[PDB]
Amino acid sequence: GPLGDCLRDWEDLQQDFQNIQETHRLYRLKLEELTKLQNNCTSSITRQKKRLQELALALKKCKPSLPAEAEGAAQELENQMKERQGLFFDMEAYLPKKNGLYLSLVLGNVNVTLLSKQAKFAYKDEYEKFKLYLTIILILISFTCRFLLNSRVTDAAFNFLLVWYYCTLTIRESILINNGSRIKGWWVFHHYVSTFLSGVMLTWPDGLMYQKFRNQFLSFSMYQSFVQFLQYYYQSGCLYRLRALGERHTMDLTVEGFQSWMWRGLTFLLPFLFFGHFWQLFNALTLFNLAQDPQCKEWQVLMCGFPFLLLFLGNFFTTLRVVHHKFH
Amino acid sequence: GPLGDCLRDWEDLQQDFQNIQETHRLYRLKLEELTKLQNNCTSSITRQKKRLQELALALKKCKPSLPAEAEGAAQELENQMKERQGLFFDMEAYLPKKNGLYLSLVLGNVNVTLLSKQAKFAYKDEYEKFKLYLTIILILISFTCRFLLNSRVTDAAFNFLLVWYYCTLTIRESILINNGSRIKGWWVFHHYVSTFLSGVMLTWPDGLMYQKFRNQFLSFSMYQSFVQFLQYYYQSGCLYRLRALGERHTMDLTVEGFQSWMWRGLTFLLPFLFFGHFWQLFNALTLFNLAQDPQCKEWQVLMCGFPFLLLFLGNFFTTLRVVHHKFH
């Protein structure tokens, strides 16, 4: 009868969930063991790192006092401790860490995915993928905007979207960095300043300058978007081929990976980046000259101009460092 | 000599880091075992849940066809499967889960802190604590603003801060909920609509209506802030005393915990919440009437008015449901 089905269901649930519950309890015990082991190991690593830093400082102090015959041995020793510290950091990267000074405000939670190099590589993949999708979204929006509407409201909607973009992306960069990579630091400031740019331009409504400006600004935005497209495609290709060959750890090789696709891609992208910085400079100059027009007193045009120059300088410096590294 | 110190340092580093590296390797193996076990257990739980849902649907289908003599046994059975499903969900809460439909956009990462009820309770504690700090920050800002400056720019700064507040807090609510609690759903929409309110009011610069309005609006904001203060202090007290007695799992007891401090605190807070909803209604009415003033055509006053009424209705409904539950 229908009751017998329920009875057999009761039997199977009893047996299988008894197994499940016992397994779950043993899971709980194993997890407690794992977390105690992790805590002990992290403490040991911290203690070793402290002693290592002390010894390295002592070596640095003694080095000027060292004559050459001891200095050669000391330099070899410093090299091998440098490698040793690198190895220690590499292993520590397999163990959980503490949020640095920002997610503490934004999350205050543990996040590290120290489960596999596979997990990290995958995560970086969807990081870049989301970048490409949302960027093309902005590109379509920008094209449509410059085409159809003179509304301030459509500009406002686009601007909300842009600032939300950049905040999301700073969270990405934060998680990525505490999970470990070579961010160089000087890139997150770019996103922060771009955010402030967008906020202030969200302010300060219509005015003859505003209409004179919006078209050029939006064209720059579209060009920058397509540049980020090129960035993605190059980075995607080079990281994939690197993973195919050796590791593709995180975006950095100190060597053109394919050395033919990599070098050619870099040398084809560089004119685009130079063009982007150049047209940003042109826009900055236009705004600067316009700021002296006496027909209107705008407390926003100059506060918009200053970040443009700051960001142009930062980009030029980053590109120059990149090419200097590439040459030698 | 100084060299001998380095040699003994080499010896100690060799020994202790050999121990460390062996332990770290055994950690890696144990972690692999743990994650494989977690995957298998989660799969088993999912399969059991699927079979349980199927059986429950079958029982629901058969129930109308069931006569009373079988229906009593069937109802008892449904009760015990309801408890069984609850227990299964409770255990599943100890195991990692998948981000729901939002962090997938915002993070796309695993986050659950299923390490202890201690960890969850602590996290909720700093959640509330951050709330109180940042709220009093806004309170001071608001007082200063209504006091000194008629600048639109100070209003803009306050508004940036407010929207950043609310976005941070929606991230809090998201992590909290996928970590497990009774959010009731209808609260996050409150934060979203408040965010849109603040964005639009960030737009639409000066105008006779703007100056006529800002003072009343900011006063409402200050009152709402102090209300959130009272909210915090009550929730803090009741959750702490609940943790002292039984568990203080997450903010919910279906019973006034102290039943003297809890009931009195609720009945003292309720007038404040009623006052807040009431003054929000007064502000909404003022804006609605002003929207008919023909001296200026503002495409923003009405789009600001509609969320006020929506939010007032939502708050009134939530409070009414709360009091209905409390009465019986």
Residues 6+ apart with CB under 8 A from B185: none
Burial of B281 (0-12, 13-18, 19+ CB in 10 A): middle
DSSP-derived secondary structure for A90-133: HHHTTS-----SSHHHHT-S----TT-HHHHHHHHHHHHHHHHH
Interface subset of A 17-36, CB within 8 angstroms of B: 17, 20-21, 23-24, 27-28, 30-31, 33-35
Answer whether B198's CB lies under 8 Å from B163's CB: yes
Contacts 24+ apart (CB under 8 A), A139-147: A139/A222, A139/A225, A139/A226, A139/A229, A142/A218, A142/A221, A142/A222, A142/A225, A143/A222, A145/A218, A146/A215, A146/A218, A146/A219, A146/A222
Q: Which stretches of chain A are DSSP H helices?
A: 2-65, 68-92, 103-106, 117-147, 152-179, 188-202, 208-245, 261-290, 301-327
Method: cryo-EM
Closest CB from B88, B115, B168 relative to A106? B168
| Amino acid in the structure at residue B30 | K
Between chains, do B115 and A202 touch, taking CB under 8 Å as contact?
no
Task: Find out whether B249 is annotated in a ligand binding site.
Answer: no
Answer whether B228's CB lies under 8 Å from B135's CB: yes
Contacts 24+ apart (CB under 8 A), B37-46: B37/A23, B37/A27, B37/A30, B38/A27, B38/B95, B38/B96, B41/A20, B41/A23, B41/A24, B41/A27, B41/B95, B42/B95, B42/B96, B44/A16, B44/A20, B44/A23, B45/A20, B45/B88, B45/B91, B45/B92, B45/B95
How far apart are the two ends of chain B, measured CA to CA in Å? Answer: 83
Interface subset of A 214-273, CB within 8 angstroms of B: none
Q: Which of B162, B169, B322 is nearest to B256 (CA)?
A: B322
Interface test with A, best of B8, B20, B69 (most A CBs within 10 A): B20
State chain A's maximal CA–CA distance in angstroms.
96
> Which helix H or strand E contains B230, and what residues bound it?
helix B208-245
CA-CA distance, B161 to B138, in Å (whole number)? 8
Count CA atoms within 13 Å of residue A50 on its CB side.
Answer: 6
- What would you report as the CA-atom Rg of chain B, rounded to the nearest whole angstrom? 27
- What is the least distance, in Å, from the CA of B88 to any CA of chain A? 9
Between chains, do A113 and B110 touch, taking CB under 8 Å as contact?
yes
Q: Which of B94, B89, B86 is nearest to B113 (CA)?
A: B94
Task: Find out whether B235 is annotated in a ligand binding site.
Answer: yes
Reduce the secondary structure of B262-315 to three states and give it as a string. HHHHHHHHHHHHHHHHHHHHHHHHHHHHHCCCCCCCCCCHHHHHHHHHHHHHHH
Between chains, do A6 and B77 touch, taking CB under 8 Å as contact?
yes
Closest CB from A41, A51, A156 relative to B27? A41
Q: Does B52 touch chain A (CB under 8 A)?
A: yes
Interface test with B, best of A7, A107, A198 (most B CBs within 10 A): A107
Residues 6+ apart with CB under 8 A from B207: B296, B298
Between chains, do B6 and A59 touch, taking CB under 8 Å as contact?
yes
Task: Find out whether A231 is annotated in a ligand binding site.
Answer: yes
Burial of A19 (0-12, 13-18, 19+ CB in 10 A): exposed
Q: Does A67 touch chain B (CB under 8 A)?
A: no
Cβ atoms within 10 Å, residue B166: 19
Tokens of B262: 């809890």
Task: Write out chain A residues lying below 8 Å of B115, CB-based.
Answer: 31, 35
Between chains, do B37 and A55 touch, taking CB under 8 Å as contact?
no
Task: Find out whether A181 is annotated in a ligand binding site.
Answer: yes
SS3 category, A296: coil
Q: Does B196 touch chain A (CB under 8 A)?
A: no
CA-CA distance, B281 to B198, in Å (whole number)? 17
Task: Write out chain A residues lying below 8 Å of B6, CB-based.
Answer: 55, 59, 77
Between chains, do A44 and B20 touch, taking CB under 8 Å as contact?
yes
Between chains, do A45 and B20 touch, taking CB under 8 Å as contact?
yes
Task: Write out chain A residues lying below 8 Å of B113, CB-based.
Answer: 109-110
- What is the least distance, in Å, from the CA of A295 to any CA of chain B? 19
Q: Does B299 touch chain A (CB under 8 A)?
A: yes
Task: Find out whether A326 is annotated in a ligand binding site.
Answer: yes
Residue with tokens 């159809």: A148
Count CA atoms within 13 Å of residue B305 on its CB side.
Answer: 16
Backbone φ and ψ for B46, nearest 5 degrees, come out as -65, -45
Q: Which residue of A has its CA nearest to B107?
A: A172
Interface test with B, best of A16, A22, A27, A151 (most B CBs within 10 A): A27
Task: Write out chain A residues lying below 8 Å of B155, CB-based.
Answer: none
CA-CA distance, B79 to B77, in Å (whole number)? 5
Task: Find out whether B231 is annotated in a ligand binding site.
Answer: yes
CA-CA distance, A136 to A226, in Å (whole number)? 8
Between chains, do B106 and A2 touch, taking CB under 8 Å as contact?
no
Interface test with A, best of B15, B23, B27 (most A CBs within 10 A): B27
Give residue A40's Cα distance to chain centre. Answer: 31
Between chains, do B17 and A205 touch, taking CB under 8 Å as contact?
no
Cβ atoms within 10 Å, residue B126: 13
Q: Does B64 touch chain A (CB under 8 A)?
A: no
Q: Which residue of A has its CA nearest to B45?
A: A20
CA-CA distance, B106 to B190, in Å (whole number)? 19
Closest CB from A52, A62, A175 relative to B2? A62
Cβ atoms within 10 Å, residue B310: 15
CA-CA distance, A102 to B37, in Å (whole number)? 34
CA-CA distance, A156 to A169, in Å (whole number)? 20
